[PDB]
Design a protein around this ligand. Structure first.
Ligand code: NAG
Lengths: 110, 157, 50, 196, 73, 110
C-alpha cells in the first residue's frame, strides 16, 4: 500500500538499529521473554546435549517506531523485517554445539 | 592512523579489484604459489579423500599499490583486507567436495613496491586415488593441485 | 538519546575506518589481551581426533 | 534495447518488498499454493524425518506490478528474481532441521494483471513420527505442513489451487517421470486446509 | 499422408515416409499440468501407439487429423 | 590496467542484470551448454543418488557488453564476475538432495 510504504519509509529514515530504544541512556527497555517448546528432538546422554525446536517470543517497545493511524490510512500493525530494527542479543548461555543467539531473521510485528 | 587512512584513500580511489593488474595490455601477472602444511588430518580411504590444514603462500605484484613512504610517515607495508585488492582465483582443483576457494580470508600484505603477499588458510579436502594392493602396508601419493580457476597463461604466470 | 549523537561523532563525523589499526603512528603495537572461559567440554572423539 | 528493462525498472522503482501488496485495509492476499512431489528420498525411522524434493507453486497478486501491454510492445509476462519482490513467507513448519524456506529462489513470473507464479523447488526434511507396531510391515502417515511464519489470516488467505474450477486437494505426481523410492510406496496423497 | 508432428521446432505439417499413415496425438499432464496444460505429442505412426491410464490418444487415417488443440485441421 | 578499469566501468554503468541479453524481447538467447564430468563421487543405491563433479560450460552473447578494442588499448577479453552480469537459470531437474542451480560464481570470460 502507498500508506504502508510511506510509513515504513518515514519510520526508518533516521532510525539507527544500533542504539537502544530509550528516551534517555539511563533508562532500560523491558523485553518480555517467552519460550514456546514445539518438539524435543534428541537427548544425547553421552555428550549431555538436549536438542529442542523452540520459538523465542520477545516483546518490547521502540519509542522511535510510533505513528498515528489517522495519518497513515488507519494502519495499526505492520510486519517489518528484524534486521531493520534494534533487537536484543538474547543468548543461550548453556549452549553446547549449536547457535548461541537467534539466526533466523524472521519478520516482526510492530 | 591518519596517514594510513590517507594512503588507503589515495590507493583505492580508482582501484578496481575485478581487474587484473597489467600496466601494459598484454602483460602477465606473476603469481608464486607455495604451500605450508599445518596438519595432515585424515586420509579416509573409503571415499578417497585427503583432509589438510594448509596455508597457501601467494605473492604477486600490483602496479597500482605503490607509494613513496617518505610521503606517508615511512609506511613501507600495509595490511589490507583481501576483498579490497585483486587476488588470483588460486584454488584447489582436485577437491572431492565443492570447496575450491580458501576458508580464512586473512588480510593481504602490500608493500610500497606493489608486492602483495597473501598467506591464507584452508581446510582442504582433496581427492587422491588409493592403491589397494598392499594395504595396510601401503604408501600413498595424494597430490594437491593448485591453479587459478579463471585466469590462464595469457594472464598469469 | 545522547548515544545517537556520540556514536555519530565517533564513527561517521570523525571518519572512523575499521580497516585501520588503532594507532597514532604506524610503528606502535596494539596490545590485545585475550582470556578463555570454558563453558562446557562437549567431546573428545578419539576416532576423529577432535 | 529489450523493452523488458524499461518495464522492470519502472515497476521496481517505487517498490518496497517489505510491504504487503494490500491495496487497502480489509484486503487479504489470496495466496494459492500447490505441491508437486519430485522424489521421495528417505524416511529415516531413527531420526523420524521424511526427506522430499518438491516443486511448490506459490501464486498471488501484487497490484504494484501491473502494466498495460500497449505501452510495452505487448509484453504480458516478465521474470523478476524473488530476492527483489515481496513474497509470502510460506514455510515448512514441521521441519526437523531449521530449513523453513525453499532451496532455489527461482524467478517470479509476473503477468500484466499482477499475477505472480513462483515455482521454487525445495528439499525438505519433515518430521513424521513412526508407527512401529507392525514394522517392517508398516505404513506411515507423513505430513508436510505449510504456513506463513510472518503473515496472519487477516493479511493472507492460504488456499489450494483451483485448476478447471476444481480444487487441487492432492499432491501432484508425474506418473511418467516419477521414480518410486525403493523402500516406500505412495498410496494416498491428499491435501487439505486446516485451522488451529 | 500429411500429419502434424512435434518432432520439429516449430511444429510442422510434414508428410510421413512410406509405412506410416496414421496421424496420432498423445496427451498427458506432467509436473506442469497447471501452468501449461497437458503435454502434446504428435507425428506419424504405422499403428496407433498404446494407451495408459493417464494418457489421451487419438489416431486417424486422414491428413492432418492431429493439430495442436489450439489449432484446427 | 587502466584501459580495463575504464572498460569495466563503462560496461556495467547502465547495465541491468535482471534483463535478458536481447536487442528485442521477441528474440531468444541461445546458450550453448556443455558438461565436463571430472569424477564420479558416489552412487547411493539405497536413496538412488549419484554425486558427480562437473563443470557446466555455458556460452552466450550479451550485446550490452560489447566494446571496440581500439578504444581500450587492444583488450579483447576480460574476466568479469558472474554476479555482475545476467546469468541463465539453468537447473538440474532430477536433483535429489543437492543444489538445483549453480552456486559457484567463478568469474566468467567476456
Ligand atoms: C494502454 O496504452 C495505450 C497507449 O499505447 C492506450 O491507448 C490504451 O488505452 C491503454 N489501455 C488501458 C487499458 O489503459
Amino acid at each position: 500500500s502507498e500508506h504502508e510504504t510511506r510509513l515504513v519509509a518515514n519510520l526508518l529514515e533516521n532510525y539507527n538499529k544500533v542504539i537502544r530504544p530509550v528516551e534517555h541512556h539511563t533508562h532500560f527497555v523491558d523485553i518480555t521473554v517467552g519460550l514456546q517448546l514445539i518438539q524435543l528432538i534428541s537427548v544425547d546422554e553421552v555428550n549431555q546435549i538436549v536438542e529442542t525446536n523452540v520459538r523465542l517470543r520477545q516483546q518490547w517497545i521502540d519509542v522511535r517506531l510510533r505513528w498515528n493511524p489517522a495519518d497513515y490510512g488507519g494502519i495499526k500493525k505492520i510486519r517489518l523485517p528484524s534486521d531493520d530494527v534494534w533487537l536484543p542479543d538474547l543468548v543461550l548461555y548453556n549452549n553446547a554445539d549449536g547457535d548461541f543467539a537467534i539466526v533466523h531473521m524472521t519478520k516482526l510485528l510492530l | 592512523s591518519v596517514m594510513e587512512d590517507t594512503l588507503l584513500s589515495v590507493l583505492f580511489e580508482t582501484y578496481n579489484p575485478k581487474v587484473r593488474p597489467a600496466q601494459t595490455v598484454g602483460d602477465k601477472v606473476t603469481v608464486r604459489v607455495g604451500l605450508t602444511l599445518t596438519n595432515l588430518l585424515i586420509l579416509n580411504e573409503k571415499i578417497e579423500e585427503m583432509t589438510t590444514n594448509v596455508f597457501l603462500n601467494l605473492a604477486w605484484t600490483d602496479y597500482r599499490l605503490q607509494w613513496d613512504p617518505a610521503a606517508y610517515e615511512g609506511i613501507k607495508d600495509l595490511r589490507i583486507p583481501s576483498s579490497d585488492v585483486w587476488q588470483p582465483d588460486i584454488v584447489l582443483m582436485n577437491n572431492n567436495d565443492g570447496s575450491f576457494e580458501i576458508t580464512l580470508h586473512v588480510n593481504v600484505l602490500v608493500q610500497h613496491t606493489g608486492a602483495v603477499s597473501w598467506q591464507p588458510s584452508a581446510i582442504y579436502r582433496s581427492s587422491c586415488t588409493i592403491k589397494v594392493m598392499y594395504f595396510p602396508f601401503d604408501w600413498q601419493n595424494c597430490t594437491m593441485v593448485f591453479k587459478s580457476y579463471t585466469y590462464d597463461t595469457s594472464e598469469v604466470t | 538519546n545522547e548515544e545517537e549523537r556520540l556514536i555519530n561523532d565517533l564513527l561517521i563525523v570523525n571518519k572512523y575506518n575499521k580497516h585501520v589499526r588503532p594507532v597514532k603512528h604506524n610503528n606502535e603495537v596494539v596490545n590485545i589481551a585475550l582470556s578463555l572461559t570454558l563453558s562446557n567440554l562437549i567431546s573428545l572423539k578419539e576416532t576423529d581426533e577432535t | 534495447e529489450n523493452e523488458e528493462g524499461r518495464l522492470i525498472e519502472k515497476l521496481l522503482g517505487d517498490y518496497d518488498k517489505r510491504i504487503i501488496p494490500a491495496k487497502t485495509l480489509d484486503h487479504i492476499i489470496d495466496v494459492t499454493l500447490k505441491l508437486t512431489l519430485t522424489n521421495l528420498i528417505s524416511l529415516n525411522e531413527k531420526e523420524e524425518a521424511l526427506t522430499t524434493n518438491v516443486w511448490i507453486e506459490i501464486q498471488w497478486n501484487d497490484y504494484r506490478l501491473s502494466w498495460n501491454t500497449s505501452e510495452y510492445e505487448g509484453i504480458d509476462l516478465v521474470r523478476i528474481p524473488s530476492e527483489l519482490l515481496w513474497l509470502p513467507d510460506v514455510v515448512l513448519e514441521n521441519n526437523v532441521d531449521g530449513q523453513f524456506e525453499v532451496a532455489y529462489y527461482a524467478n517470479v513470473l509476473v503477468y500484466n494483471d499482477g499475477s505472480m507464479y513462483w515455482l521454487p523447488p525445495a528439499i525438505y526434511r519433515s518430521t513424521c513420527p513412526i508407527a512401529v507396531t507392525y514394522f517392517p510391515f508398516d505404513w506411515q502417515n507423513c505430513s508436510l505442513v505449510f504456513r506463513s511464519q510472518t503473515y496472519n489470516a487477516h493479511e493472507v488467505n492460504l488456499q489450494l489451487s483451483a485448476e478447471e474450477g476444481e480444487a487441487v486437494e492432492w499432491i501432484h505426481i508425474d506418473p511418467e517421470d516419477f521414480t518410486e523410492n525403493g523402500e516406500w510406496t505412495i498410496r494416498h496423497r491428499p491435501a487439505k486446509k486446516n485451522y488451529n | 499422408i500429411v500429419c502434424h508432428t512435434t518432432a520439429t521446432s516449430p511444429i510442422s505439417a510434414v508428410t510421413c515416409p512410406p509405412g506410416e499413415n496414421l496421424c496420432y496425438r498423445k496427451m498427458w499432464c506432467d509436473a506442469f499440468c497447471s501452468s501449461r496444460g497437458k503435454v502434446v505429442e504428435l507425428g506419424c505412426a504405422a499403428t496407433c501407439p498404446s494407451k495408459k491410464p493417464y494418457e489421451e490418444v487419438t489416431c486417424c487415417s486422414t491428413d492432418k487429423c492431429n493439430p495442436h488443440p489450439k489449432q484446427r485441421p
